Amino acid sequence: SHMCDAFVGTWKLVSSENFDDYMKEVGVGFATRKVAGMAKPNMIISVNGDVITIKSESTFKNTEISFILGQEFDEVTADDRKVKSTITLDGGVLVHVQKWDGKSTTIKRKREDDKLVVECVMKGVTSTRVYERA
Numbered sequence: 001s002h003m004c005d006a007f008v009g010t011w012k013l014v015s016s017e018n019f020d021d022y023m024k025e026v027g028v029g030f031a032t033r034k035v036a037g038m039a040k041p042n043m044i045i046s047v048n049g050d051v052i053t054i055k056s057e058s059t060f061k062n063t064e065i066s067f068i069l070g071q072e073f074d075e076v077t078a079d080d081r082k083v084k085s086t087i088t089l090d091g092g093v094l095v096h097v098q099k100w101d102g103k104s105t106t107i108k109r110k111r112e113d114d115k116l117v118v119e120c121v122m123k124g125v126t127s128t129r130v131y132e133r134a
């Protein structure tokens with residue numbers, strides 16, 4: 001009974017494009033790029049009241065964020081950046097902006113057919129990561 005409804009569930013990574021180039025743009029080092037690029041995460045999304053939780057479980061590094069839309073929070077990313085994040089809903093798309101060290105990256109998550117498509121942008125470099133229901 002909320003529009004974030006169509007994101008809720010357990011999702012498994014099924015394709016990725018350009019993720020190595022995105023990670024380079026972000027500043028991820030060689031060994032982390034290689035190990036992280038292998039990972040096939042499951043993404044678990046839930047909602048409880050105003051609080052959204054997004055968990056990522058993988059061979060590389062389990063993560064979990066909980067947040068309220070529009071309200072900034074601290075996040076330690078899988079690659080160990082300490083970032084300040086704000087997530088909003090813009091026309092049905094969850095828009096996640098991460099700021100650190102004067103840099104910014106945006107991760108958009110949207111439902112498209114039976115997929116959840118994740119677009120990660122750092123400057124001119126975009127990676128597209130497609131998830132299907134587990």
Ligand SMILES: C=CCn1c(S)nnc1COc1ccc(Cl)cc1
Pocket residue numbers: 023028032033036041056077078079107118120129
């Ligand atoms: C950015 C995309 C969000 N995401 C997806 S989709 N799968 N894993 C992640 C978490 O972000 C990472 C950032 C840098 C590295 Cl090295 C590894 C993961």
